[PDB]
Structures are given as C-alpha cells and as structure tokens.
Structure 1
Amino acid sequence: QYSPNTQQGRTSIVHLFEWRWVDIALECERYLAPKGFGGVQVSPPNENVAIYNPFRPWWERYQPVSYKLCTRSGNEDEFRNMVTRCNNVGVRIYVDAVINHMCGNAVSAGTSSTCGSYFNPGSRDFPAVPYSGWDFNDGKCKTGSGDIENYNDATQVRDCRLTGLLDLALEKDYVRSKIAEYMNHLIDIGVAGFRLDASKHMWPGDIKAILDKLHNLNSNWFPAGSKPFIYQEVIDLGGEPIKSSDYFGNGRVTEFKYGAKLGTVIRKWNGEKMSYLKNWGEGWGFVPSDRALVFVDSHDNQRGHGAGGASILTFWDARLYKMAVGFMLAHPYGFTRVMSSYRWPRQFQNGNDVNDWVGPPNNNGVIKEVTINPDTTCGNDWVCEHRWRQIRNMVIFRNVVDGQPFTNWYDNGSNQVAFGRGNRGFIVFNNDDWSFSLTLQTGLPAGTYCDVISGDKINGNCTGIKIYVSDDGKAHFSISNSAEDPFIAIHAESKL
C-alpha cells in the first residue's frame, strides 16, 4: 500500500483537477512523461449528480450516483484509453475514490446524473449499483439531525452524514463488495492506486476489510505482487479524538499540517520565520515521512473549503507559492503531490469568496479542452502550475536528488536559508526584506551550474543565472529581495 508504484526515478504526482481523460492522455505523452512526472491524480471517474443550482460546481463530483465510468471528464472508453496511453509512457494514474457516501439526502429524485442513471435520495434508492435503504447508516447514526454535529465524538463522525451526504454502511459485506467490485474494475484497467476520499469519516477497520478484497496491479504493466498505492484523506490537525495515525495500517495519509504550517511560515505570520524550518518534518509533529503524502495546496483548501484556512498558499500568490513548492520539492520529507488548477472569478465579500463553488472552464456545462500556448503555458483558463518553469524544474530537481540526505543547512536567523541534498543538489532562499549576498558551502563538485529557477540548461548554456562552484564546494549566491523569484536551485543535471 505504501509504495506509489511510480517508475524508478519519478518522485511526484500531479493533480490534474477536473481535466478531461483525452487531455490527460495527451498530457502524459507530450509533457508528463518527458518531464519526469511520476503520475496523475484524477478527479472521481464514477457517475455523479448533475447540480444546476449553482451551475455545475466542482463539488458535485463528490456526490456519487453509480459506479459507472461516466462523467464530464469522459466515458469508460476514453478513461481506459487514458490509462493505457499514460501507462505505456511510464506515468501512473491514481483514482479519487469517493466510497464513504453517495449524494446529498436533500437531492431531488430523477435522472439528473452525468450518465442519466436514475436515483432517489429520499428513498435511498440507487438502482444502478444497486443500493437500497438497507445499505445506509440511517439507523446507526444517533444524532438528532442525522448529520455529523460534533467532531469530538468519533462515533458520529463515522456513522452519520457528512453535511447531509448519504452515509454508506461500510460494515456490511454487500456494500464492501460493491465498492471492491468498482475498485477492482479500475485496478484491472491499469490504475496504480487510489485516494480514499473522506477517510476520516470511515472506520479504519472497514477500510481494511475493503482493501483486503482488492486485486494486485495489472501484471501487464506491473511486476507480480504489486499492491495498489493507498493514500487516505484524513484532515488531522490538533485536538481531535480521531488521529491520522489510526489509519497507518491501510496506507499513507494526507498530512494537512504540512501546507498549513508552510503557509504561515512563508507568509511570516505570528512571528514565524524560515530559519525555523531547520528541523522541518517529524520534528514539527507531522506523521512519519514514509506514511505522508504532502502538498502545498489541495483542490479543497485552495478555495478555503478545507483545513489550513487563510494561510494556505495557491497560484493566486504566485511569488510565494513558487517558493513554497520549491521548498517542498527540495526537502526529503514525504511523497509530493503537485497541484494543477483552473482560474475562477474569485469574489470576496466579508472575507469569504462567494464564487468558491465555480466548476471547471466550460461552454454550457461542457468542460473546455486544455490548450497549449507557444510558450508551453495553458489557455482556456487552465492555470497549469505543473508547467511553470520554476515548478517543473523543481519536479526534476527532486528526481535528481532522490535518495540524497539533507545537509549543508544554513540560515541567517531570519528568512534567509539554504541547504543541499547530498552532493547532487543545493537550494537557497531569500524571504527577508533585504538582499542576500554570500558564499555558501554547497557540497557540490566544482563546475558551472545553471540556476533552474531563473532559467534552464539549454545545449551547453544557461538561459538564466549561472553559479560557479569552486574546488572546495563553495559558491557565491546573490538574491535581491526584489527578484521575481527570490530563490536559486542547482543540481547535478543542471551542471554545464
């Protein structure tokens, strides 16, 4: 469960949020594979409720109607096509598995689904699975409203409705089998793993019972005995009866404290400073590195819909965002997930964004295709952070330094820090309100290195800053607090 199953050498996955299968297939071949990305997290591929009020929001995909591979992202044929092409190029696919619940109980019955399947929330009828009233936790939940009312009670958090979402009775073998049937169908198709949505709302034991019914990965692409990569979505900050450590026996867990803390540190909130990142990782109360799935922002908290709140950094904060992502990708802690989003009309009122529901770029509900500009950037309102030079080059940096230890740390007691990874990489950050000019020990072999943040190494030459490492491994770095990107990164493969 704990291994990503990525090709040797690729250390990151990217969340291509709301992308169409056909676009992902193309991206795998034209960019993801050549650039060294390990895999892709896809949006839920199963049929969901079609909400029109508000129009088509992104969260309608977390309200299942059936396990049919039929959504705004494409049909089953297109989905299978994407997995095959991506796998054939060495890029894995990770499915977002929404198995804790079905749609909201207040949703009207009918055929308002992405595939026309009929459903009736009121009577607990989902004939396309099929599921009936006997398959939900309505009789098990003890709250007066039937919804989760108090998170201090670990029992209702697992047996009651998350904001009204019909809760599946995961202790019943029938339900466990229907879910395994769905996941095994995907595994046999070729997916390498899953993101278990709302894992906190499920009993660790119920999850285990389901994982026990899962097949090994497709032997046409994976070595015999390969188990699917499992990362459970558990929002565990401090003070809750439920701990993410309770789920270690099933696979990895999302470390939401990672992005929240990095955000406040980079934003320099509450007296925090980058020099405190010296013991970043478990020393900060995070889960063990071999059980952590980390990220700066997620599709949820990038719009204030999740843990982290206001401190979370996103593409909206481009400058600080690139720095945070750079630090994450350079630091050895956990397995990294890169975010890829779309622009939406952010409309703040009394501190909250009233347009946080807006779905992907579309034409009358039809998701727009991802277009590639001449400068490798995207159009149609897709942000494509994974294509930003500073982020893409750090993705490669992580691959190059994979396995190298954390060393040669340096800090000015404020917001100017630096560190290297063995003798394959070195990175320097300047987040102070003054310039940084100093000679540091990089631990790298002598030579001329191209700064991969400001430029690239293109055929024996650098298109940006050049760093010169002397015989004793020392090198001079100059970063003004006015630089577009206040940090420099160089590695073994950026050496001239």
Structure 2
Amino acid sequence: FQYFGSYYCQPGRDVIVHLFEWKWTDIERECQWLADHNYCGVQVSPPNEHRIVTDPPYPWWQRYQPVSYTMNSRSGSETQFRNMVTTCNNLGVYIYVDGVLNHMTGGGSGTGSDGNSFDGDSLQYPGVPYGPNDFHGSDDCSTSDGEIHDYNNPTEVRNCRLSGLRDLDGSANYVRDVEAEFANRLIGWGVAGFRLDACKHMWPGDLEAILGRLNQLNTQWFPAGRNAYIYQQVIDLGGEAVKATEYTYLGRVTEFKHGQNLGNVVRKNNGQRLANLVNFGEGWGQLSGFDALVFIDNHDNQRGHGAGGFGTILTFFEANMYKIATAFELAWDYGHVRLMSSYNWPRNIVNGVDTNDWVGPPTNGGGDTKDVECFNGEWICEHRWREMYNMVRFHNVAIGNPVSNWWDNGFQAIAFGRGNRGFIFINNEDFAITQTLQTGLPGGEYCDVISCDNNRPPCGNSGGACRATVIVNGDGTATFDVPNGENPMIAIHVFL
C-alpha cells in the first residue's frame, strides 16, 4: 500500500495557511511574504469549475458544488492557477488543493464558473461527463428524501446525499478514473497535496482506490518517488458510527476535537482550566499527533457550523482569546498546524445561527473577488498578525525539541519550554503574576516576541507595546512579570 500522510517542506518551514477565497494572483504575490516568514504552504479554495449561485448572490459555499474538473474558478483562470503554483513552488511555498470528490451540485440547473451547464435534477454534468449511472440513488440510499439523517448508520452517511448534494458513486471505476485524472493533472502542474472535502461521506476503500491511481510529485520541485500529501476532512467529535481512525491509514485527518478542546479551555467554558493542558494531545482522546492536521478554526466552524454553534470555537472575532489558543497550538508539539486566514463578513447571530453565514469574499459585484489588502476591515490576514507569525518563528526554532520545564499555578496560568530553544508563559488569569522559573534557555537578554519584533535587543517596537527585555540568569531561571488582559503571554526564544 501507499501512505499519503507525510508532507514535504523546505528546511525551517512547517506551518500551512488556508488563504480562504483568495484569488490566484494574490496567493502568488503572498508566497514571497510567506517564504520570508517561513511558512511551508497554502491550502487553496476549490479551483475546479463550480456552481455560480446568484440567490443568494455569490456565496462562499458555491465553490463546494463542483460542475466539472476544468480549472476556471472564482479565484481565477487555469493560467493564473499555474502561474501561482510555479511561482510559489520556486519560492519553496507549496500548494494544497481543496479537493471536492464526494458530490457535484445540489438540485436545480445552471452554468458553472467555466461555462459548462449542470442539472442536479437529471444528474447531468456534461463537462465531466457524468450521468445518473455515476451517482448513488434509490438503490443505495433508503431515506425518504434521499438525504442523510442517521449518523449512526455508516451506509446512510456515505451513500445518501449530504444536504441534497448529489452523491457520486465512488465505487465505480469510471468515477475513480475521472477523479484521479483531475488530481493527477494538478499534481502534474506542481500541486503538492490535497485537503479532501467531506471524507466522512466517502468510503475509505473508495478513497484508497482513488489514491492508488495518483502519480508521484513533480520532480521539477519535489524529490523523486514522493507521494502527494493528503489530509482528509473527517468531522469526528465522537458519538457517531464514522470515525477518524478509519481514515488514518490513508493519510492525515483533520482533528476537530483539537479546536473544540482548546476553545473550551481558553474560554474557561464550564470550569475549564488552562492548567489541564499539561497533557494536551492524544491523551485527551484525540488522534496521535503524527496522523493529525490541527487548527483552532476553519472556514465552516468560524461560521457556527461546528459543535456548540458559537460559544466554543475561537475565531478572529474573539481575537485576544484566539491569539492565546493559537500561540499555545504553535508552541506545543502536536499535529501538523494549519492557520485559518479569513475575510470579514456581517456575522449576525440570531437564535444561535448566523443569518449571514452565506456571504462570500470581499467583492465589487458580479461574483468577482477584490484584490487582497490586509487589515483594511475586509481581509483579516491572521497569518500576518505579529503574534501569529512570531509564534510561527518560535514554532520553527523549537522544531524537534520536546516540551520541557512545564509549570502551572493549578488554574489559568501555564508555562513551558521546548528543549533549550524557546519558552512561553501564558497568563489567562485576571491578575498579574511575577514568577521565576527554569526556562531551559541559555543566559542572556531576550525580547518578548508576542509584543516585540525581534528575539534579541534591539527588540523593535513596531506594534507600540513591546515589553521590557526578559533576563535569563546564568542558571536558566528567568523572572517573568506577566500581566493580565491583552496579549497576556510572553514568549522568548533563541536564533535559528
């Protein structure tokens, strides 16, 4: 068998970013910034021909309804996609395609983003081509409306329609061949891997058959004999018949418990305590780190589509807590870390549901997408926040070192190091703390990289609130004066 859960990064780089609904021209430009800040790669929105939905006007979710496997999408043309992949690969920042293989469109008919028609009522997709024989139907799904209802029934979850999305027959050799041709075309252009959408709704054996058809990566950039990187979106918070552990033999799996648990802890929901993170990871009932793709939020659950609705998951709308959770995730050693990168929208929670959760990316109309301008109130650019990218640098310097020198106060303050490379103190209490601890670091003067620009003096004050330098004594102990409130954490580390 082939295993696909191993990614490939340039030395010093590891973290990936979901540039949600970014155009190809903007990602191509961003790859220089990403390389300079030693990110490893970018998850891109579905790049194949997708539905154009005009009621409501051009929602983000139209891109999760494929119309064909041509490569003209809201983010740009096939030419712009290949320009992006070439430029990014040449910079050592790789591309992971959001691959939508479980389904085509919902009901109704229309014209996709590349001019091909679709008809969900007659199951006709002439741009592929698919017809009714290529879909699950009444022979495979016994629910009255043909949709999924009982998530304790794996056959229903995998053969019925997710919210009416016409469900492809992944057991058929024709569908397996067509979908592998799509993936291999993108690998041939230089794509490094795939975020596979809706994997809980597909049979592992069908995924195995598709992945077995894949070509290895393009040796213009990648080592000879290297499998594509595959991570699978499987939503598994327990209490269902489909499990994340069914998919880990194929590749990595999205661990949604990770963001649920860190969200509840940092929010202090129902008496949670930051000190409980002392054993965070697989010991919390999660996937092993080697099999997991981890993240604080993603494009679905920042819109309330995850467990709890709103109130557990942390997003850029809860920026201070979001930064605390992301800093912990980046400083810890658990999973392949993905950072969400978002756009603003008029989130309007009524009875626990966002009435405006459909709104697409910043647009001037007609279904276009604006050019990105970070921090303009429309593009959030979390990956460009100093607290984020400086903790990515911390994460990179710490690579290969275990967690060491753990301390906690029993409640909402913790601290720990990564070997002799970095140390972080997180004060989620409502009072200030002065505490001397073994940091494990060599004696010297360090800057707090949460508030400052650099890791050593001169610390750099581009954010205006760079804290006083931290002195690590000869014995490695440092005295941490850590305040409560905004950015209530100090992180120090050595040079690469």
Deviation at 1:238, TM superposition (A): 1.4
- 2:447 partner amino acid: C
Flag structure 1 segments of 5+ consecutive residues without an equivalent. 372-376
Partner of residue 58, structure 1: 60
| Partner-residue secondary structure (3-state), 2:121 | helix
- 1:379 partner amino acid: N
Question: In 2, distance between residues paired with 1:281 and 1:3?
Answer: 19
Question: Is the Cα–Cα contact under 8 Å of residues 39 and 93 in structure 2 kept in the other structure?
Answer: yes
| Partner-residue secondary structure (3-state), 1:367 | coil
Partner of residue 116, structure 2: 117
- 1:445 aligns to 2:448 (yes or no): no
Give matches, 1:28-427, under 5 Å: 28-29=31-32, 31-104=33-106, 106-107=107-108, 109-111=109-111, 113-138=112-137, 139-307=139-307, 309=309, 310-364=311-365, 365-371=367-373, 377-379=374-376, 381-427=378-424
| Partner-residue secondary structure (3-state), 1:25 | helix
Partner of residue 23, structure 1: 26
Question: Is the Cα–Cα contact under 8 Å of residues 415 and 424 in structure 2 kept in the other structure?
Answer: yes
- 460 and 276 in structure 1: CA distance in 2 versus 1, 3 angstrom threshold: closer
| Partner-residue secondary structure (3-state), 2:97 | strand
Question: Is the Cα–Cα contact under 8 Å of residues 455 and 494 in structure 2 kept in the other structure?
Answer: no
- 1:136 partner amino acid: F
Deviates more, 1:308-317 or 1:330-339: 308-317
Structure-1-length-normalised TM-score: 0.96
Deviation at 1:24, TM superposition (A): 0.2
- 1:134 partner amino acid: N
The superposition leaves residues 32-76 of structure 1 with CA deviations (integer Å, 9 ceiling, x where unpaired) of 010000000000000111111111111110000000111110000
The superposition leaves residues 462-485 of structure 1 with CA deviations (integer Å, 9 ceiling, x where unpaired) of 122211101110001111213x20
Question: In 1, distance between residues paired with 2:455 and 2:240?
Answer: 51
Deviation at 1:149, TM superposition (A): 1.5
Question: In 1, distance between residues paired with 2:100 and 2:378?
Answer: 27
- 2:194 partner amino acid: F
| Partner-residue secondary structure (3-state), 1:369 | coil
| Partner-residue secondary structure (3-state), 2:258 | helix
Question: Is the Cα–Cα contact under 8 Å of residues 455 and 495 in structure 2 kept in the other structure?
Answer: no
Deviation at 1:307, TM superposition (A): 3.9
The superposition leaves residues 407-459 of structure 1 with CA deviations (integer Å, 9 ceiling, x where unpaired) of 10000001010000000010000011111111111000010011100011288
- 275 and 459 in structure 1: CA distance in 2 versus 1, 3 angstrom threshold: closer
The superposition leaves residues 331-384 of structure 1 with CA deviations (integer Å, 9 ceiling, x where unpaired) of 00111000100000111222321111100000112100012xxxxx43361000
What percent of counterpart residues are identical?
A: 56
- 1:126 partner amino acid: Y
Question: In 2, distance between residues paired with 1:420 and 1:459?
Answer: 17
Question: In 1, distance between residues paired with 2:455 and 2:386?
Answer: 13
Flag structure 2 segments of 5+ consecutive residues without an equivalent. 461-465
- 2:25 partner amino acid: V
Structure-2-length-normalised TM-score: 0.96
- 1:315 partner amino acid: F
- 246 and 459 in structure 1: CA distance in 2 versus 1, 3 angstrom threshold: closer
Partner of residue 471, structure 2: 468
Deviation at 1:204, TM superposition (A): 0.5
The superposition leaves residues 149-203 of structure 1 with CA deviations (integer Å, 9 ceiling, x where unpaired) of 2111011100000000000000000000000000000000001100110000000
Partner of residue 480, structure 1: 483
Question: Is the Cα–Cα contact under 8 Å of residues 448 and 490 in structure 2 kept in the other structure?
Answer: yes
Deviates more, 1:279-288 or 1:451-460: 451-460
Deviates more, 1:304-313 or 1:456-465: 456-465
Question: Is the Cα–Cα contact under 8 Å of residues 102 and 168 in structure 2 kept in the other structure?
Answer: yes
| Partner-residue secondary structure (3-state), 1:163 | helix
Deviation at 1:114, TM superposition (A): 1.1
- 1:202 partner amino acid: M
- 2:494 partner amino acid: A
Question: In 1, distance between residues paired with 2:16 and 2:411?
Answer: 32
Partner of residue 374, structure 1: none
For this pair of structures, how many residues does the alignment match?
A: 484
Question: In 2, distance between residues paired with 1:357 and 1:52?
Answer: 12
- 2:440 partner amino acid: G
| Partner-residue secondary structure (3-state), 1:55 | coil
Runs of at least 4 residues of structure 1 off by over 3 A?
Answer: none
Question: Is the Cα–Cα contact under 8 Å of residues 410 and 417 in structure 1 kept in the other structure?
Answer: yes
Question: In 1, distance between residues paired with 2:52 and 2:487?
Answer: 42
Question: In 2, distance between residues paired with 1:456 and 1:110?
Answer: 51
Question: In 2, distance between residues paired with 1:184 and 1:158?
Answer: 24
* Correspondent of 1:8 among 7, 11, 34: 11
Question: In 2, distance between residues paired with 1:15 and 1:307?
Answer: 21
Deviation at 1:110, TM superposition (A): 3.3
Question: In 2, distance between residues paired with 1:398 and 1:361?
Answer: 31
